[PDB]
Amino acid sequence: GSPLFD
């Protein structure tokens, strides 16, 4: 849901 933590 973000480039780093979904």
Side-chain angles (χ1 to χ4, degrees):
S2 64
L4 303 181
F5 50 85
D6 273 307

